[PDB]
Symmetry: D2
Subunit: 353 residues, 4 copies
């Protein structure tokens, strides 16, 4: 019925905000809108690893299933440039982890259930929102009502909330699709993340736990992605090996081949009156470890710090005059990503021993 | 009225490049103008050098004033990442040149005057345009008129033309300003382009001809850029040296300090009926050699190639069905830039001896 | 497998284009993406009536169910202005008809089945489209393929096609919702359409066949619309009667009360390479007879005329150089609507004897 | 630096109205300027007259030069629809006034100079603004600075301020241009405002003081507007008479013929942190008395009322939580205009005797 914070969306990013607030005393509601290696994985960078540790779920993730990488090798299909480095050259214990998204989500979901100030509502789609001066009024599809000082949108692109607040995102078609799959290679990957640049973007081999398995991200024209998805495994395996310059010898696909579109989503606003948005902007694709849930987790970390400060101070956590501090940080950061000025830093990041 | 195949609106570097590039095709072209170490310089990459060589102005540029660089060194203010390489390690004769924009423009402007199929009109601001099915009707402010099969917008962001065709750009504030200036350093730069990444973007030292002068690009918050522009030279020199990790020893600013905003400009369209746009999109700032006039020059090179082809085949160079090939190419390229997938290729680019 | 024209969407507007092309020789595909008085009705104006007659379905509509209105009365809740006129004062046999949308759709659907050059595909959602230079390639969700010289989007707002062609609409929230319902009144309506202007927009009583039934359009704040929808019938009936200045005596609601949002949708483009869009723009709400399916039917009429001309001439009906003629007409018209310069003309329109 | 409560950017009619309207509140206000029948006139409706009367400049306007109209007659070039009424039929003393914009502006400018809590700064172009949590920092081009609790943008479309706050307008080309001119007619206009609808929009005859002069608004295609602007007076006069169905007999143009574009400007936001915008949105053209400076004057009236209230209650007049009340009102009004639901009310509006 009455909460401080209502989080719309119960994905990794929304759960991370909810888990993050625990200890603050804020009453939080999250409203939802033995298995083999899942096909969707992320390259979890050093800043996300720090967040997950602060949240108390990183060790749960490492114990379930996680693949640590220690080296990086990047080159170009048509020209002579290369970047090659390892954790040791920079005083790191490791560069990052390759982790299944469902593993991360599960760890955060369990933690959320164990958090005394979090209420998870599982059938809880929104029907309406009224943006009152002093509080927000949320009506769920069952007609039940909920009041909040602050609404946090963590539901994908947040189209619905952004529409209600009249702060739309700008969508940008990146004209290429990404094919993903699990590939067994002849040579071991040696816990090195590898990527080759080419005319239709990138081809990355992300090392998994099995010394001879990688999960790939292969960007292609939408047409070529479709061809590669529908090809015989022999055609596919040969095309992949050539695209990867035979770097790990023969390749054998070992999973379904899935394709999804690549897009940018750019925000002129990350907040309004009693509204803050996380996880919905998307800028660069490369470096893979600087984006996806890593960007959303950075959104989450910064929102968490700001709300904890405001709440400490007895301030109204929903007022735009304070939320604009979070927004500014997010916009500055988005700009550095789009300007190409953030990629280098994320590429070379890692965790100290 | 005067009748041409192509009317290029804007006589800056990119528009002049298109006009010069078309020479030899037989297309009648009109260019309508709408309006010491020089402080505005570009890092001219290998693809731009190739174009300028095809156009016959590169040797002119080299003879006037140009600074060749052979090495690259990039690092991070807060971490241990670094990229460091030279031309020889990749079979190149050089990586790029630091060139004043005004030198490039003069070289193109002279070449344009020497081109038999180009008419340069100055001043020739536009008052109106009518987009007929078969030709375009251009009215200048003096009331003189011009017909063209195809209009090419090469006038900055092309706001006027884009408004008339109802295909606006999306503007994106990059929340940081760039300070530029000529800096004398204690240590010689050894013809290495250097750049450090930091919390407010980049700081690049672009080597000039004088062994101890660099032109910088220092991105900063708008407030800090203002403070650095207005600081005493001693405060500025000290802040810069620290920002650059003392990499070339003591720094002494030797010119005016100029500041300008960093922005993105994104296009859903690069063409319409009897209209093609060059030089108005802007994506990444880093790498510097991949952007600015380098992006505009690639727009130019691709438009030139497409129009020469269409003209050779007797096709109507103004029909959108044929211009969308050019558009598709620029959009695919825009996408790879914004997605972060093009920067690497441009960072490592260079010129082959042969 | 191979058609001239593929119409994406089989609603009233898409069917009207398909029926309209009949006689041209164009091969057309339409791909879909004893009952009481339906709650959704339109005020069909004189230009739509002419279209439907040219299409050969108007008499089918009149024989099924249609309500003819002969007079108009408009006034203001707070001030003294009024517009009052009838068909006779202007030499008309009638001003318009109130017709159920499902009746119109049914008539057009039957006509489409009887049209030799139309193929209706009922399970036929789109999966992909490739915009080739010479033709378009449409892949349906069953994986079957279809080629077309021209694609016509007639699927609501056409978000999907507009996204693929990168020509998005601009959405504008009109900040009010419309409540609709069937109302029995004490006084007969005398086949007069009535509307009162008020602080939250309009309240229109559209006369139905039964001399004492009207279908209403009541625009309200989203909150008040919700209140009115959920109110007891007594509260509702009293609120309505007051809002309508008791013009037809006591009111008794006789149907479900439905609410839907009011929005504008503005197009910078109505065509691209091998693509034309109908039925997706939306400008004014008042006059009701100038908008809704009336706007879409005018889109349809103009596209039909242009494609018939092009086809006569042996021209490539998909080339933007020709489609931009249709686009220009649509944009000029949209502008006159938004500028407030078209409403008067539609308000006073009617059919000559 | 100078310290004020409210800094109004733009010294046009709307900005001056806000400044004058606030007098009596105790708020310190700064206005920063950014830059015969006169040809630009407005149909000043009853709500605008009410505001101008509250501000104490309406009698000044009436004494200088103003044309009162008592009747309205609207019809259609191609059909038999018509609207025809007078003030008396509705209990009004008059419907509206046709007034030169320059007369309204001078009256407001003088009143502004007579207002003890207003400082007019001329010239005072902006160079920069910093949006601090507690106050705004304004830097003028001369380098002088100003702090304000609230910035009010009243400078045309407010592009600069809207860009800085990242809340851009949506621009919409209305595909037609308006030709304006002073026309002498054979028959007297009898203080009736007249308008005919036609295929390219409207043609309005706005009555002036002289019994046989009207100021017109003739919307046309851009091409036809150009042809009418450049035609001989005999061709123009004949075309106009036909377009007006000979309603006032023979027409004789008596001034320059000026053309300008018709456009819409739509706002998703009218406020942000320490920022409120007036006068920059534009929706319908018809009815004429409902739009133009009438829309800006309603923005002003509502902003004035809200700020006086906030100030009376000791609230921070710059916080978005309080400005969103004003915003909500302007957006609801914008919506009703674009939806076609406001025009009727404005068409029939007028002033009560008492
Ligand atoms: Cl942990
Ligand atoms: Cl050369
Ligand atoms: Cl932005
Ligand atoms: Cl075409
Ligand atoms: Cl019929
Ligand atoms: Cl007065
Ligand atoms: Cl437009
Ligand atoms: Cl606030």
């Amino acid at each position: 019925q009455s909460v401080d914070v209502a989080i719309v969306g119960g994905g990794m990013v929304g759960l991370a905000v909810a888990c993050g607030l625990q200890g603050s005393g804020l009453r939080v509601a999250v409203l939802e809108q033995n298995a083999p290696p899942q096909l969707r994985v992320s390259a979890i960078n050093a800043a996300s690893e720090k967040l997950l540790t602060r949240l108390g779920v990183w060790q749960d993730i490492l114990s379930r299933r996680a693949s640590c990488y220690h080296g990086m090798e990047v080159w170009d299909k048509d020209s002579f440039g290369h970047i090659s480095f390892d954790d040791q050259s920079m005083g790191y214990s490791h560069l990052g982890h390759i982790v299944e998204n469902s593993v991360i989500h599960y760890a955060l979901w369990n933690k959320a259930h164990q958090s005394s100030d979090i209420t998870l509502l599982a059938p809880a789609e929104l029907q309406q929102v009224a943006w009152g001066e002093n509080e927000t009024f949320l009506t769920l599809k069952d007609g039940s009502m909920l009041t909040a000082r602050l609404v946090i949108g963590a539901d994908g692109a947040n189209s619905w909330l952004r529409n209600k607040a009249d702060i739309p995102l700008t969508f940008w078609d990146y004209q290429h699709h990404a094919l993903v799959a699990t590939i067994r290679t002849e040579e071991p990957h040696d816990a090195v993340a590898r990527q080759v640049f080419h005319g239709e973007g990138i081809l990355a081999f992300l090392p998994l736990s099995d010394p001879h398995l990688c999960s790939i991200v292969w960007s292609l024209s939408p047409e070529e992605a479709q061809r590669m998805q529908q090809a015989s495994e022999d055609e596919f395996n040969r095309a992949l090996n050539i695209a990867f310059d035979n770097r790990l010898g023969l390749c054998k696909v070992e999973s379904a081949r899935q394709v999804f579109p690549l897009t940018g989503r750019y925000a002129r606003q990350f907040a309004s009156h009693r509204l803050a948005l996380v996880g919905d902007a998307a800028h660069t694709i490369h470096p893979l470890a600087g984006q996806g849930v890593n960007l959303g987790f950075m959104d989450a970390a910064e929102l968490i710090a700001e709300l904890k400060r405001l709440h400490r101070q007895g301030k109204d956590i929903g007022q735009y005059i304070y939320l604009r501090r979070y927004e500014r940080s997010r916009k500055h950061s988005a700009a550095l990503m789009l300007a190409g000025m953030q990629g280098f830093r994320d590429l070379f990041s890692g965790t100290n021993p």
